[PDB]
Scaffold this active site. Sequence first.
Site, mmCIF file in Angstrom:
data_model
loop_
_atom_site.group_PDB
_atom_site.id
_atom_site.type_symbol
_atom_site.label_atom_id
_atom_site.label_comp_id
_atom_site.label_asym_id
_atom_site.label_seq_id
_atom_site.Cartn_x
_atom_site.Cartn_y
_atom_site.Cartn_z
ATOM 1 N N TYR A 162 -1.547 -10.693 3.037
ATOM 2 C CA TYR A 162 -1.359 -9.284 3.436
ATOM 3 C C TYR A 162 -2.741 -8.812 3.791
ATOM 4 O O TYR A 162 -3.538 -8.520 2.929
ATOM 5 C CB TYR A 162 -0.723 -8.444 2.316
ATOM 6 C CG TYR A 162 -0.738 -6.924 2.493
ATOM 7 C CD1 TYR A 162 -1.053 -6.309 3.739
ATOM 8 C CD2 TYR A 162 -0.380 -6.087 1.412
ATOM 9 C CE1 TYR A 162 -1.046 -4.894 3.881
ATOM 10 C CE2 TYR A 162 -0.353 -4.721 1.515
ATOM 11 C CZ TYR A 162 -0.695 -4.105 2.745
ATOM 12 O OH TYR A 162 -0.682 -2.721 2.795
ATOM 13 N N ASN A 163 -3.056 -8.853 5.077
ATOM 14 C CA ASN A 163 -4.392 -8.561 5.531
ATOM 15 C C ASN A 163 -4.482 -7.071 5.877
ATOM 16 O O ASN A 163 -3.635 -6.535 6.589
ATOM 17 C CB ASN A 163 -4.766 -9.467 6.699
ATOM 18 C CG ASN A 163 -6.185 -9.322 7.106
ATOM 19 O OD1 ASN A 163 -6.464 -8.932 8.247
ATOM 20 N ND2 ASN A 163 -7.104 -9.664 6.231
ATOM 21 N N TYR A 164 -5.509 -6.404 5.357
ATOM 22 C CA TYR A 164 -5.601 -4.978 5.587
ATOM 23 C C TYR A 164 -7.047 -4.527 5.515
ATOM 24 O O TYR A 164 -7.417 -3.898 4.546
ATOM 25 C CB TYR A 164 -4.828 -4.226 4.528
ATOM 26 C CG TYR A 164 -4.683 -2.751 4.801
ATOM 27 C CD1 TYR A 164 -5.364 -2.122 5.858
ATOM 28 C CD2 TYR A 164 -3.856 -1.995 4.022
ATOM 29 C CE1 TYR A 164 -5.202 -0.735 6.107
ATOM 30 C CE2 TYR A 164 -3.687 -0.643 4.245
ATOM 31 C CZ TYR A 164 -4.365 -0.021 5.268
ATOM 32 O OH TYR A 164 -4.118 1.318 5.438
ATOM 33 N N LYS B 89 1.187 -10.350 6.896
ATOM 34 C CA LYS B 89 1.296 -8.967 7.297
ATOM 35 C C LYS B 89 -0.100 -8.562 7.596
ATOM 36 O O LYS B 89 -0.955 -8.680 6.723
ATOM 37 C CB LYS B 89 1.795 -8.098 6.173
ATOM 38 C CG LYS B 89 1.738 -6.647 6.535
ATOM 39 C CD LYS B 89 2.265 -5.779 5.413
ATOM 40 C CE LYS B 89 1.833 -4.357 5.621
ATOM 41 N NZ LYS B 89 2.396 -3.434 4.565
ATOM 42 N N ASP B 90 -0.356 -8.140 8.841
ATOM 43 C CA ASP B 90 -1.706 -7.738 9.284
ATOM 44 C C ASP B 90 -1.656 -6.266 9.564
ATOM 45 O O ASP B 90 -1.021 -5.810 10.521
ATOM 46 C CB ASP B 90 -2.093 -8.531 10.511
ATOM 47 C CG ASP B 90 -3.512 -8.365 10.890
ATOM 48 O OD1 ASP B 90 -4.377 -8.051 10.028
ATOM 49 O OD2 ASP B 90 -3.808 -8.612 12.079
ATOM 50 N N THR B 91 -2.253 -5.488 8.678
ATOM 51 C CA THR B 91 -2.293 -4.051 8.900
ATOM 52 C C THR B 91 -3.559 -3.780 9.633
ATOM 53 O O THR B 91 -4.636 -3.628 9.052
ATOM 54 C CB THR B 91 -2.197 -3.234 7.620
ATOM 55 O OG1 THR B 91 -0.848 -3.349 7.111
ATOM 56 C CG2 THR B 91 -2.469 -1.741 7.957
ATOM 57 N N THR C 280 0.840 -1.216 0.000
ATOM 58 C CA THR C 280 0.000 0.000 0.000
ATOM 59 C C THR C 280 0.855 1.238 0.000
ATOM 60 O O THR C 280 0.614 2.204 -0.767
ATOM 61 C CB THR C 280 -0.886 -0.022 1.254
ATOM 62 O OG1 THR C 280 -1.782 -1.148 1.136
ATOM 63 C CG2 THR C 280 -1.673 1.226 1.368
ATOM 64 N N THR C 281 1.866 1.272 0.852
ATOM 65 C CA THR C 281 2.743 2.481 0.872
ATOM 66 C C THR C 281 3.384 2.672 -0.509
ATOM 67 O O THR C 281 3.591 3.804 -0.959
ATOM 68 C CB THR C 281 3.818 2.318 1.949
ATOM 69 O OG1 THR C 281 3.152 2.117 3.180
ATOM 70 C CG2 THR C 281 4.696 3.551 2.120
#
Lengths: 286, 284, 284, 281
Positions: free
Chosen positions: A128-130, A153-155, A41-42
């Site tokens: 990649y959980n967000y 990766k859990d945002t 995302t970044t």
Amino acid sequence: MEIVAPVITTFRGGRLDPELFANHVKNITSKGVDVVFVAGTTGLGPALSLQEKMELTDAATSAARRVIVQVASLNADEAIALAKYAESRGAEAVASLPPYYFPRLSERQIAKYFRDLCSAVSIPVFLYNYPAAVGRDVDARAAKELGCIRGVKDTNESLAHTLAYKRYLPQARVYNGSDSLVFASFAVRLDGVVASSANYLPELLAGIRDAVAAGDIERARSLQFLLDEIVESARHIGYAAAVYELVEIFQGYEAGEPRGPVYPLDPEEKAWLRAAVAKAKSQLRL
Amino acid sequence: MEIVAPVITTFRGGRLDPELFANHVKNITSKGVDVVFVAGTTGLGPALSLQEKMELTDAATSAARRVIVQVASLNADEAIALAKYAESRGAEAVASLPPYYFPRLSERQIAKYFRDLCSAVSIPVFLYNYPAAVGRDVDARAAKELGCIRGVKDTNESLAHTLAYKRYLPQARVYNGSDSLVFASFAVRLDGVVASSANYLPELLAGIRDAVAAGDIERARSLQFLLDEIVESARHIGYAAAVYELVEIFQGYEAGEPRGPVYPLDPEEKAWLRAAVAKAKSQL
Amino acid sequence: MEIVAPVITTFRGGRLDPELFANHVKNITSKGVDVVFVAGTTGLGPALSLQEKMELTDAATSAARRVIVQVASLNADEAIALAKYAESRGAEAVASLPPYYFPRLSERQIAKYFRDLCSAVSIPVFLYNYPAAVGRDVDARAAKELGCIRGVKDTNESLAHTLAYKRYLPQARVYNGSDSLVFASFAVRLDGVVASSANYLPELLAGIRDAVAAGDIERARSLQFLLDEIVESARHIGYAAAVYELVEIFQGYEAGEPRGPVYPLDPEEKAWLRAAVAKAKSQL
Amino acid sequence: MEIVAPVITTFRGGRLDPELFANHVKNITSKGVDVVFVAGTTGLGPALSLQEKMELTDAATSAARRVIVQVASLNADEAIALAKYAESRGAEAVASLPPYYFPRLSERQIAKYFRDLCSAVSIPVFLYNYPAAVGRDVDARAAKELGCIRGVKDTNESLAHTLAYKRYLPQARVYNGSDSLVFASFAVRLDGVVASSANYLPELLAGIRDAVAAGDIERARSLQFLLDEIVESARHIGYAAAVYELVEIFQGYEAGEPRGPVYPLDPEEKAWLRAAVAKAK
């Protein structure tokens, strides 16, 4: 425990500029970033074409030794295609957002997505959980049912939500993706953090990891709170575009620009941000 | 770092039974609970009459040396009246949810509520923040602005939200109130936790705390997962009634019962729960 | 199609002034209100003691021929008691919010609450659904499952959610509780509206209903937008308290006042609101 | 008042199939659909390449007289380029979702996006508001503030939110985008509906529209309720993919497939859906 940078994608003149990118990657990895997470995302992943993500994969893998490539696309063949490309470029893993945008896809459709991704490569696939960005959550129970996830990766502002993946996936590498939880993530010993501030203040993050390792929770927390103030300022003028400006402010080189609808800060916004973080950057000098 | 128990309110027949309550407080306070938090959400605070909260204050302040009484009421005069009563009974602090139920009260309203509480007593007033139940959040910035908040219980899955209160009120004592964050709270050195599971497994929480304090973060985490597994089963059938049965299951005595609309578990629900936690009660 | 008023609860001093309340009921039923819905959210229901609701039940059934009494309480026994007392004074029906506040509640416990309500009386029991306040939605399917709902007031911006109850419960009276959907509800032929603005502009609501029946959709919509502007101003300073002032502004008499934590508007807020509605006031 | 179809994009083997598309468009427009909304959500728009959106613009403008092309892209140059292409192909308007996915973009970024679109073409630009999918709302006040919005599609269960655009933008054509509000949209006289069910049951929508115009509110409603039971089953199974099966079931020709991550329904799912709808009154 790792510091993973979801690295920015550096445009100049409407096109990707490797070398802005590579100079940036080399800088931050020399300052404590262990792993580079490209097209996150970044890094504007959802806004990048397949071919842009391929360029980024090439630029990241030639600039850093450990690379995870985020591969999601609302055309799933491109996610598979890119996964394979990244694997061939030496990425140590691929990651993917769940299918985003479309409300109420079925569980079967999400599962097929990730399962096709796992079939396509031998390197680990990370979830990649967000939920805030994606519009759905793939929690620890669901991630376990996928049956092939080897990393998360859990945002997520819910550290319990992130810890739950270590519970259900004891072998997976589990990371929290939230800047405000960096201190906490080291404290509870997640595998690492993927924090956007790894772009502009990686030495603050290593400062925190060091503090937590020394048992200096007061220093960890205090550095966290500094980071929070900086994040807060940047959120105020539009965080995705502000990351670039923070890189210039804190690291001292040209960081390129995002691309619209994530338009670059204008010069007024940049002047504002620079002033906003000066209160708190003399409190810094790391 | 303290373990605070949002102690259950122990009805029998249909009426408050202050002696189940005291047996219960005395037990958990001997099993690691440092502070009794009376009439919280776990104690069904909002379903209790002023008189009931009064009787509960008397029982707590009789059974325990450290009592914080939760006083919120949708009649602010009853909140103030209880606060004064709580102080007169030797409570060490009082706490309040913000005004709840009514959507979109103004900030002036919410602020006047807390400020009127502070001016009514000389013991500390704690904010008890619980956005999911209350329907509004009073975050750390808002709490600093209230001007008189001496402690915070933040029932919030967002640990950074809890942690912000230490950022803005570094003098206040700040506790997180989610059971799933006990390990993390100790890990990040909040002043303690207020956890519903202090009713039924206080010695598990003292274990997590101990393990965090050692450095056996891996033990802490593993105790915490055991605990999550139990909360989950209880969530499945109605956590608020299930707390009472978990107490019986793990602590071995009669726990009394909630009052409807929070109706007590039925025999089928209890059997199911007993069987559901038996899986993890052995791993203990 | 009815205009139902969720009448405000008129305090003066710290206490209920039931003469104020009756003069208010009398005036608004003389101007197009068909049913009086006592002690709902606009009436500060959850903030009221049993005695306040009995008092409102007495005054309402005295001043108005059609009264629905809202009975929810977080002591279910009080809800049952009030329902029965409401029947006995000639209420035409009782309504209840589902059990609110407590997040941790099971379907069994929600089902039991409504079923015990239905058992307690012979007059009809409306579900009063209001998810944003209550923290829980009892949708049309869930409402049919309860097996005894004879009516629904759904305070919900989702008009489809509300229409869903007519589909699932064809014999029930279904009303939308949202001020911003009065025009829409008449247009889709719900059984009527329960609108807070019935306290202060019942003749605007009747004007919308007339316009819709006259097929004059454009006037209907334009009266609705006028209403929206007034509601939005009120929302800005604290809707719950502002309703009282809007009664004074538009109906011309003393409406009394809410009670803290729903504190009355202060004089600056009253002055602001009077000037905020003035543009739209002169255009009726 | 208009029936606008947010038309499915018809793939075969993951490649776009313009003939299935054109047949579907011609059929639904002959059964009540007034306008074709191409590459919206029902059409998998965010999943389509620029190339595919241009092909779809070509096929839709060639198969239908009134076409609105949805242009949103997370590369803003592509949205601008597609808006120009759609105009050049005769679209009567372009619509755009606000920038989606990225949480907390600035208001300045959102405003720039829309104004750059408005500047790019002379035909009307519609706001296509869909907070549940987009993660942000551009409400009526915000839409007026943009200063160039001439139409709104509002996919929103809150009919009042949709009616506010008519209050702040009295000249704007305003549509509700939710299937469950078709009856209510006509009853409150919005400018029309953009309903995904116009793909599979356009004649049922036309029927609701006729019932409302004839003052036959009880028929409108029960037709709306029939429709809700169908939508509910489709939702149960994965709506986006179910839409294709419902076209076949209800319109009696082939509808192609969606493309993954919106995978086609499987046999079991299609069979379940068929039974669910046969029973659906």
